[PDB]
Design a protein around this ligand. Structure first.
Ligand SMILES: C=C(O[C@H]1C=CC=C(C(=O)O)[C@@H]1N)C(=O)O
Ligand SMILES: C=C(O[C@H]1C=CC=C(C(=O)O)[C@@H]1N)C(=O)O
Ligand SMILES: [Cl-]
Ligand SMILES: [Cl-]
Ligand SMILES: [Cl-]
Ligand SMILES: [Cl-]
Lengths: 206, 205
């Protein structure tokens, strides 16, 4: 129903497993925002537990780093219970989607937003789409986006593409993202590294 | 170019396409044909035979478009992008093509005709800082048939963006080309499972 397949568990990439970055960017905490992409209960539910816990543990470490380094933390979250118009073509792939219910829509407790964090609404794959993300990045004078969350090859990648397209340098945190499969997750990193983003590991940010 | 050396490969046929999850169908009253980045600069790295096949199929879909009153939209970069325009494209793709006709023209076999939508390509999405969405909207068209290059880059990202805009995209799998068969197949697989119908030229015509 969810359109989200059964997720076959897999090991997260380590530093050694990343594709070669073509861009030469580096996170500057004065320039960066940490995008915690779609770490809603609904989206993490299909992750097997160990992998989920690994990914979320990494995202959490990056979040604390961002807090320590004055980097805005932006959470994207679908509102739930999208009507048929709001859902649009998401229905065809992903069914009606999550409910506007805490069981579905809350960001997971391990990543609980803190006061002042950017709470962004997710509508489509790109975190920019119909969101305030770009405007906030401009206002905050932040032109780097550090991405963690789910799903690597879907909103995370497409958000990184959009960021890139908007001349926002994206950094995909390879071990703070998770995906439908190892193959997808690797595909996402390969795409990002070769097309729109730096691919890095959590340890490389902190 | 940052465009890798392209390893020739055979274009997919209907049998080779991934399963479509969506159940859409091209309706000529609803559709626009996007000829995506079929500029000489972007076709130059293609080996000739593959290029000719892709261009030929694009040309077949173009003709079908014209015969069915489907607007044909060409995207094309302006060439010689300045720093502001080029942005982070520089880091992946160098300074890009020149504004010379030799680079920037739409290939002759796909020459735009009077009336066709001449859109400017800036970024991977054909919608990015273009007029595509506004034109789809004004023209009442909510399907986008994509051909062109590169499958996994602007074609796919254009499809994603179309999709995200509730514009049903149809990826014409044999009227696109890419940096490699693996990219091309990845694009089709992505599209079919996330944002588009993947179809062949024959299935349009
Ligand atoms: C976690 C993401 O959200 C998409 C993917 C699966 C299901 C979805 C839904 O039911 O709305 C979302 N369109 C992401 O974009 O990566
Ligand atoms: C054919 C496309 O254009 C991008 C990819 C390769 C090189 C480019 C450049 O030099 O600007 C474009 N950014 C496409 O988006 O697929
Ligand atoms: Cl594994
Ligand atoms: Cl928002
Ligand atoms: Cl082949
Ligand atoms: Cl335009």
């Amino acid at each position: 129903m969810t359109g989200i397949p059964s997720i076959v568990p897999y090991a997260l990439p380590t530093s050694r497993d990343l594709p070669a970055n073509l861009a030469q960017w580096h996170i500057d905490p004065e320039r960066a925002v940490l995008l915690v992409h779609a770490m809603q209960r609904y989206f993490l539910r299909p992750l097997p537990d160990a992998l989920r816990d690994q990914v979320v543990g990494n995202a959490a470490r990056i979040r604390q780093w961002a807090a320590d380094n004055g980097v805005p933390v932006a959470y994207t979250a679908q509102p739930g219970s999208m009507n048929e118009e709001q859902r649009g073509l998401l229905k065809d792939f992903w069914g009606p989607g999550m409910k506007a219910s805490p069981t579905d829509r809350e960001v997971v407790d391990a990543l609980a937003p803190q006061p002042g964090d950017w709470l962004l609404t997710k509508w489509r794959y790109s975190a920019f789409f119909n969101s305030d993300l770009l405007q906030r990045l401009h206002a905050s004078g932040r032109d780097q986006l550090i991405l963690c969350g789910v799903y690597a090859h879907v909103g995370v990648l497409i958000s990184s593409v959009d960021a890139y397209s908007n001349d926002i340098q994206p950094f995909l945190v390879a071990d703070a993202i998770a995906d439908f499969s190892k193959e997808h997750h690797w595909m996402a990193m390969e795409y990002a590294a070769s097309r729109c983003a730096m691919v890095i590991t959590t340890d490389e940010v902190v």
